[PDB]
């Protein structure tokens, strides 16, 4: 997961 | 966003804005870390009454009560059940929609921030900030907390947004290395597409490697990130009158005038703290740093040494995407670097001046960011991704006033009401708003159609082909999809590649998942589905070729159906990808009146070895309509 | 000056501003290091055509051409002959009226700066900046260069200003330790006075020692510096919820939230770099500094060590005059200092938060005499009380050259600006000069002596708490030798009811009484008068001073002062008397009847003894009106004159 | 001299  | 909307050509006179009323009657949901409500970007000055259709709640919580909403921020909701279920022993500090990270606030303002007078990023990019859709209603849905971020909360957040009747969904998050039936945003997005809600998501920031993107699903608008035509300057003036407009983002009006400059190969590397500490009067001296591939380390060493300033020689694309500039200095290109070095070597008492907080409005533009994730989609190769290009590099938007923003020196942190931020996170919300407005001008258009308009009308040129920042060559559809969003045109595409909820079910059906995996995605919008079909009516084309052996001539046929949203007739213009031939049939489409549908078949004959690009454009004969679709060949890579 | 005019009560609706059209039709001359023309403060957005009376030039020079003037900056002239004569070998980098220092630009804008939208000192004192007289005309006369400042040049600047037809003169410079006939500013001031031009001059910044002021001449309006009600905030919040509004001028929006605070006596002194260098994680920790009398040194040691911030315990007045705050932090008084130190000792994990760029306009009491403002009596001439009046001088926001050092962050970063905070009597004088000009516009016939009268007898000796203005240095009541008649009150000065007027001849007669040699005499009066057969030391002044030798035995003394008051209002006034401690005073008549410009005299008499400067006053209150003509009275030792 |  990763918030962009 | 003090310039972004101008860069897109949006204005009150004509185009999407006037036709959409700046999206006053439309609602865009933002799924992120929450929002900071008191921001100026979220006030409701020129806002009419809230559409009666809306019934979303303003859920109370920590430092957030049911009066925090208005005619702008019409909804605030959060979802933390996943967190607590995971560990009920946890004390969630900010148990509400209030943003304690910033990501959520920045995105919300970009998509529909209200006009905000006299703001800037520490002097840079000054002006009035506003969302790509200044009058769109905001519906916040916080699923990301400091204490954690859970998939189930994400899905719960989307489901609620769709249930609330939102018009569009904006989500700047992504997951990699998982199959569709384990992909959170994809599962929820499928449900959204099933109910007429278009989802705009970032492609990710792990470019430029091949197939590095996420959210690459057929039922998602996958958005890439490009540079604008804005630049920030520390004008460099040498003692000999030589004036060079370099790059700088030092967050303050530093005063470096007629200061001594030195060029010394023993420390030119700017990697040794000990060496740099040997320069006498380091506080009144400007040191020159060679291009060594690690600019951010040089800046660290410089800042720690407390030099007056430094002239960094570099063309590393990373430098032009970061706002980290805690010490006065300038970045110059290789040519300029030689001029500066020469001046210094041919002079005793070489001096320099540098001013800051300067912002200018660059060629070429736009340009695909080197870190913007690339296709093809390892979630599904069949459909080209990403879909479209939008501004995402160093964009100005609202930000929580009580969190770290940037830095000065090694010990001084600074906060701000508006900050510059880069990534696909900034780009997606631009597309979300544009889509929201297109939906306002055409209340009957489907998510697929709206995406069609945005794509077939996108601009592949910057008047040359948009470049890839990583290599400086022409950008591919796997880099920028159809190209740069062009809102005003999107309003009148002439022809759209439409699709229905049933079409996607048919597509999902063809993937041949177990009926359990199928239900996981469905999940209650369709049952396990007797007309499987992998040829989804998509406004783009991708021809795939295996690399597991000898390469031989391959052929692929695509079936498309274009509906007329304009009586009219189009002729197909073809540019076939390199080392391949293409053909269409029929070569001419005739329309007797609005809403009439017409089908055709594109056929590519290609051989692999390397992603080649071409296109098909339906140009109206008695008008100015031009419907363009990109074509790209690609190897078959490891899928998740 | 984003608040100063509000602090003075000036406004467009009523008072001096409307009565004088914001001084649009008057002209004030600024004698200093020049000006930065392209400043927003010197543009002419709301300026009517230049008064035809004016014919001053826009003299060309280095980076300055004859088109650099407008309907706001109507005159520009520089004087360097003194520097060249002294050495022709000198290369004058900026050979024109352009300001390369800042002093001149700051004063200019304070006196007659045009309205300038959205300015500040790095976020502090934000708002619209404007001079005390927003529409007054500017005439710049530069006599101060980076290469040198010369008396003769100064005198040449004034003479030229007076000759140009200037209505008022403002000069923020002062010389000490020289007799009148060697006092450049005074010599020229006499000439200016002789021709009906008032000169506002700073009192000096070498207070609070007795008789430390300069420009203390009878023919000069000597100005002292006071604090305003404005304060700059670094709100301090402890982990326990305790919130304190401390002092801070860090020139940026620093982010220090929930950081660990430490109090370690071994270093609480904040005077050792070695010790402070021993605090682990100095970049995320906040150290508390004890009061050691040298805050500015502490700040330096802290800035060198790179602490995230420091809480300074200090009540030293010098701290509240300086904009030097290169590192995040706050200053707190003795009591608050204990509250903070306590919290830390009674806790493991004591944290704190400090915000910045906060300005508040509520301080009490205000104004207050700056501890550094020069004090009377004038060692140029004990005969007349100095200074004359008080005006805003502490941390005033005004225009500034964009290309010179303004303030600092960390040890290596210098910052520049278009508007900066600056302190001193230099900032005060221009306030007076501007007001003096508007009075002159409202009453074109009033003399320089009358206009100074309206400002003095109408001044306010009480602060915003309605108590007697305090002396920052001691916290006791300020004396006339500290603040003259008191704090300027423009709107009242517009309508003083009565005035202590005077004429050129009156100053000649006063000059003669000084009993100089006739060459010395001519040195001062040059050609405005000739060596004068009616000496008179009793100049008709709007204030009184009673001097007493301190050599030998003290014995009940007696002094009589004769005054003439002309009615600028039919009315009658009654004299109210407050006699200086340990002394008696009486007037006569005790009432004054007026039929309609009519003049009427009276005599004040004081019986006092020396030991110490005691203060009293005499106010003529109108019976059938609301006029009040007040004049300070002060006793003073006879100290060494220059 | 002194510029105040
Ligand atoms: C979650 O918040 C609770 C307070 O609302 C914490 O429990 C309380 O902690 C206080 C200060 O540590 C203590 O005075 C209270 O008696 C205690 N109990 C209650 C019912 O509030 C809790 O802290 C944890 O549990 C407590 C009981 C202590 O053992 C702490 O050391 C624990 O950290 C908070 N939980 C966490 C993980 O912080
Ligand atoms: C280029 O950078 C070098 C590293 O700072 C300089 O040499 C350093 O000079 C210091 C005294 O100025 C001395 O303490 C250091 O030991 C020495 N460092 C090294 C790695 O040798 C150099 O200065 C020149 O060379 C030194 C050795 C002295 O001879 C100086 O007089 C020379 O200027 C810097 N500049 C040049 C032109 O070399
Ligand atoms: C005052 O300005 C003069 C002219 O700009 C300087 O003289 C000139 O200096 C130049 C650089 O040194 C040189 O190229 C010129 O030939 C020289 N002479 C002329 C007529 O231009 C002068 O500099 C001083 O005198 C010169 C001749 C040198 O010997 C220097 O050592 C001196 O600084 C300037 N004077 C000063 C005090 O700076
Ligand atoms: C109060 O300040 C003292 C002086 O800075 C601290 O002692 C210093 O501690 C350093 C490492 O913490 C050590 O390298 C220095 O030699 C030493 N300096 C002196 C003058 O003693 C002191 O820290 C405590 O005492 C020292 C000696 C160590 O034992 C530390 O572990 C202790 O914390 C400071 N007192 C505190 C932090 O409570
Ligand atoms: C007098 O000085 C002014 C101030 O600049 C000159 O006007 C400027 O000319 C420069 C050319 O380098 C332009 O960049 C500025 O925009 C001009 N500004 C204004 C206000 O005119 C003017 O040319 C000078 N006059 C002469 C005769 O040299
Ligand atoms: C909640 O919102 C804000 C943020 O805390 C509060 O200030 C409000 O306080 C309540 O309402 C305001 C308008 C004021 O009357 C105050 O006295 C009240 O306590 C609160 N608003 C509501 C509707 O509860």
GROMACS .gro file of N, CA, C and O in nm, chain C residues 77-132:
model
  224
  721UNK      N    1   1.753   6.577  -0.391
  721UNK     CA    2   1.879   6.649  -0.399
  721UNK      C    3   1.982   6.590  -0.303
  721UNK      O    4   1.946   6.547  -0.193
  722UNK      N    5   2.108   6.587  -0.344
  722UNK     CA    6   2.214   6.533  -0.258
  722UNK      C    7   2.332   6.630  -0.247
  722UNK      O    8   2.352   6.714  -0.335
  723UNK      N    9   2.408   6.617  -0.140
  723UNK     CA   10   2.517   6.709  -0.111
  723UNK      C   11   2.641   6.635  -0.063
  723UNK      O   12   2.643   6.581   0.048
  724UNK      N   13   2.744   6.633  -0.147
  724UNK     CA   14   2.864   6.554  -0.120
  724UNK      C   15   2.992   6.635  -0.118
  724UNK      O   16   3.099   6.584  -0.085
  725UNK      N   17   2.982   6.763  -0.153
  725UNK     CA   18   3.099   6.850  -0.160
  725UNK      C   19   3.190   6.834  -0.038
  725UNK      O   20   3.312   6.842  -0.050
  726UNK      N   21   3.130   6.813   0.078
  726UNK     CA   22   3.207   6.797   0.202
  726UNK      C   23   3.297   6.676   0.199
  726UNK      O   24   3.410   6.680   0.248
  727UNK      N   25   3.247   6.567   0.141
  727UNK     CA   26   3.324   6.443   0.131
  727UNK      C   27   3.438   6.457   0.031
  727UNK      O   28   3.551   6.417   0.059
  728UNK      N   29   3.408   6.513  -0.085
  728UNK     CA   30   3.508   6.532  -0.188
  728UNK      C   31   3.619   6.625  -0.140
  728UNK      O   32   3.737   6.592  -0.147
  729UNK      N   33   3.580   6.742  -0.089
  729UNK     CA   34   3.675   6.837  -0.033
  729UNK      C   35   3.770   6.768   0.065
  729UNK      O   36   3.891   6.788   0.059
  730UNK      N   37   3.714   6.686   0.153
  730UNK     CA   38   3.794   6.614   0.252
  730UNK      C   39   3.893   6.517   0.187
  730UNK      O   40   3.999   6.489   0.243
  731UNK      N   41   3.857   6.466   0.070
  731UNK     CA   42   3.941   6.371  -0.001
  731UNK      C   43   3.872   6.362  -0.137
  731UNK      O   44   3.756   6.322  -0.146
  732UNK      N   45   3.945   6.399  -0.244
  732UNK     CA   46   3.889   6.399  -0.378
  732UNK      C   47   3.919   6.260  -0.432
  732UNK      O   48   3.864   6.219  -0.534
  733UNK      N   49   4.006   6.187  -0.362
  733UNK     CA   50   4.046   6.053  -0.404
  733UNK      C   51   3.938   5.948  -0.382
  733UNK      O   52   3.953   5.833  -0.424
  734UNK      N   53   3.829   5.987  -0.316
  734UNK     CA   54   3.723   5.892  -0.283
  734UNK      C   55   3.634   5.859  -0.403
  734UNK      O   56   3.597   5.947  -0.480
  735UNK      N   57   3.601   5.731  -0.417
  735UNK     CA   58   3.505   5.688  -0.518
  735UNK      C   59   3.368   5.666  -0.455
  735UNK      O   60   3.345   5.565  -0.387
  736UNK      N   61   3.277   5.761  -0.476
  736UNK     CA   62   3.143   5.752  -0.418
  736UNK      C   63   3.055   5.656  -0.497
  736UNK      O   64   3.002   5.691  -0.602
  737UNK      N   65   3.038   5.535  -0.444
  737UNK     CA   66   2.962   5.431  -0.512
  737UNK      C   67   2.823   5.478  -0.554
  737UNK      O   68   2.785   5.465  -0.671
  738UNK      N   69   2.748   5.532  -0.459
  738UNK     CA   70   2.613   5.581  -0.488
  738UNK      C   71   2.610   5.733  -0.483
  738UNK      O   72   2.578   5.792  -0.380
  739UNK      N   73   2.645   5.796  -0.594
  739UNK     CA   74   2.657   5.941  -0.600
  739UNK      C   75   2.526   6.008  -0.640
  739UNK      O   76   2.517   6.071  -0.745
  740UNK      N   77   2.425   5.993  -0.554
  740UNK     CA   78   2.293   6.051  -0.579
  740UNK      C   79   2.208   6.043  -0.453
  740UNK      O   80   2.259   6.012  -0.345
  741UNK      N   81   2.079   6.070  -0.467
  741UNK     CA   82   1.989   6.071  -0.352
  741UNK      C   83   1.936   5.932  -0.317
  741UNK      O   84   1.857   5.916  -0.223
  742UNK      N   85   1.978   5.831  -0.393
  742UNK     CA   86   1.934   5.694  -0.367
  742UNK      C   87   1.992   5.643  -0.235
  742UNK      O   88   2.109   5.665  -0.204
  743UNK      N   89   1.908   5.576  -0.157
  743UNK     CA   90   1.945   5.531  -0.023
  743UNK      C   91   2.009   5.393  -0.024
  743UNK      O   92   1.950   5.296  -0.071
  744UNK      N   93   2.131   5.385   0.028
  744UNK     CA   94   2.201   5.257   0.039
  744UNK      C   95   2.216   5.216   0.185
  744UNK      O   96   2.293   5.125   0.216
  745UNK      N   97   2.143   5.283   0.273
  745UNK     CA   98   2.150   5.252   0.416
  745UNK      C   99   2.016   5.207   0.472
  745UNK      O  100   2.007   5.104   0.538
  746UNK      N  101   1.912   5.286   0.447
  746UNK     CA  102   1.777   5.254   0.494
  746UNK      C  103   1.717   5.359   0.586
  746UNK      O  104   1.596   5.383   0.583
  747UNK      N  105   1.802   5.421   0.667
  747UNK     CA  106   1.758   5.522   0.763
  747UNK      C  107   1.669   5.627   0.696
  747UNK      O  108   1.562   5.660   0.746
  748UNK      N  109   1.714   5.678   0.582
  748UNK     CA  110   1.643   5.784   0.511
  748UNK      C  111   1.510   5.740   0.454
  748UNK      O  112   1.412   5.815   0.459
  749UNK      N  113   1.506   5.620   0.398
  749UNK     CA  114   1.382   5.567   0.341
  749UNK      C  115   1.279   5.543   0.451
  749UNK      O  116   1.161   5.572   0.435
  750UNK      N  117   1.326   5.490   0.563
  750UNK     CA  118   1.239   5.461   0.676
  750UNK      C  119   1.172   5.589   0.726
  750UNK      O  120   1.049   5.596   0.737
  751UNK      N  121   1.253   5.690   0.756
  751UNK     CA  122   1.201   5.818   0.803
  751UNK      C  123   1.105   5.880   0.702
  751UNK      O  124   0.994   5.921   0.737
  752UNK      N  125   1.147   5.885   0.576
  752UNK     CA  126   1.065   5.943   0.470
  752UNK      C  127   0.924   5.885   0.470
  752UNK      O  128   0.826   5.959   0.466
  753UNK      N  129   0.914   5.753   0.474
  753UNK     CA  130   0.784   5.686   0.468
  753UNK      C  131   0.702   5.708   0.595
  753UNK      O  132   0.579   5.714   0.590
  754UNK      N  133   0.770   5.719   0.708
  754UNK     CA  134   0.704   5.742   0.836
  754UNK      C  135   0.637   5.878   0.838
  754UNK      O  136   0.531   5.896   0.899
  755UNK      N  137   0.699   5.976   0.773
  755UNK     CA  138   0.650   6.112   0.776
  755UNK      C  139   0.539   6.136   0.674
  755UNK      O  140   0.439   6.201   0.704
  756UNK      N  141   0.556   6.082   0.554
  756UNK     CA  142   0.460   6.109   0.446
  756UNK      C  143   0.445   5.993   0.348
  756UNK      O  144   0.421   6.015   0.229
  757UNK      N  145   0.459   5.871   0.398
  757UNK     CA  146   0.441   5.753   0.314
  757UNK      C  147   0.299   5.740   0.263
  757UNK      O  148   0.203   5.759   0.338
  758UNK      N  149   0.284   5.709   0.135
  758UNK     CA  150   0.153   5.686   0.078
  758UNK      C  151   0.098   5.551   0.125
  758UNK      O  152   0.173   5.469   0.178
  759UNK      N  153  -0.032   5.529   0.107
  759UNK     CA  154  -0.093   5.404   0.150
  759UNK      C  155  -0.032   5.285   0.075
  759UNK      O  156  -0.034   5.282  -0.048
  760UNK      N  157   0.021   5.189   0.150
  760UNK     CA  158   0.081   5.070   0.090
  760UNK      C  159   0.014   4.941   0.139
  760UNK      O  160   0.030   4.902   0.255
  761UNK      N  161  -0.059   4.876   0.050
  761UNK     CA  162  -0.138   4.756   0.082
  761UNK      C  163  -0.055   4.632   0.116
  761UNK      O  164   0.050   4.607   0.055
  762UNK      N  165  -0.103   4.555   0.212
  762UNK     CA  166  -0.049   4.422   0.242
  762UNK      C  167   0.101   4.411   0.261
  762UNK      O  168   0.167   4.333   0.193
  763UNK      N  169   0.155   4.489   0.353
  763UNK     CA  170   0.297   4.481   0.386
  763UNK      C  171   0.314   4.434   0.530
  763UNK      O  172   0.217   4.430   0.606
  764UNK      N  173   0.437   4.398   0.567
  764UNK     CA  174   0.465   4.354   0.703
  764UNK      C  175   0.614   4.337   0.727
  764UNK      O  176   0.695   4.346   0.635
  765UNK      N  177   0.650   4.313   0.853
  765UNK     CA  178   0.788   4.278   0.887
  765UNK      C  179   0.798   4.128   0.905
  765UNK      O  180   0.799   4.078   1.017
  766UNK      N  181   0.804   4.056   0.794
  766UNK     CA  182   0.812   3.910   0.797
  766UNK      C  183   0.691   3.849   0.866
  766UNK      O  184   0.704   3.752   0.941
  767UNK      N  185   0.574   3.906   0.841
  767UNK     CA  186   0.450   3.854   0.899
  767UNK      C  187   0.404   3.933   1.020
  767UNK      O  188   0.288   3.925   1.060
  768UNK      N  189   0.495   4.009   1.080
  768UNK     CA  190   0.461   4.090   1.196
  768UNK      C  191   0.413   4.229   1.154
  768UNK      O  192   0.455   4.281   1.051
  769UNK      N  193   0.323   4.287   1.233
  769UNK     CA  194   0.271   4.420   1.206
  769UNK      C  195   0.217   4.431   1.063
  769UNK      O  196   0.243   4.529   0.994
  770UNK      N  197   0.142   4.330   1.019
  770UNK     CA  198   0.084   4.329   0.885
  770UNK      C  199  -0.025   4.434   0.872
  770UNK      O  200  -0.080   4.478   0.973
  771UNK      N  201  -0.055   4.474   0.749
  771UNK     CA  202  -0.158   4.573   0.723
  771UNK      C  203  -0.117   4.672   0.617
  771UNK      O  204  -0.024   4.647   0.540
  772UNK      N  205  -0.187   4.785   0.611
  772UNK     CA  206  -0.154   4.892   0.517
  772UNK      C  207  -0.065   4.996   0.584
  772UNK      O  208  -0.101   5.052   0.688
  773UNK      N  209   0.052   5.021   0.526
  773UNK     CA  210   0.144   5.120   0.581
  773UNK      C  211   0.119   5.258   0.520
  773UNK      O  212   0.091   5.270   0.401
  774UNK      N  213   0.127   5.361   0.603
  774UNK     CA  214   0.115   5.499   0.558
  774UNK      C  215   0.180   5.594   0.657
  774UNK      O  216   0.189   5.565   0.776
  775UNK      N  217   0.227   5.708   0.607
  775UNK     CA  218   0.290   5.808   0.692
  775UNK      C  219   0.188   5.877   0.780
  775UNK      O  220   0.067   5.868   0.756
  776UNK      N  221   0.236   5.945   0.884
  776UNK     CA  222   0.147   6.020   0.972
  776UNK      C  223   0.068   6.120   0.890
  776UNK      O  224  -0.044   6.158   0.926
   0.00000   0.00000   0.00000
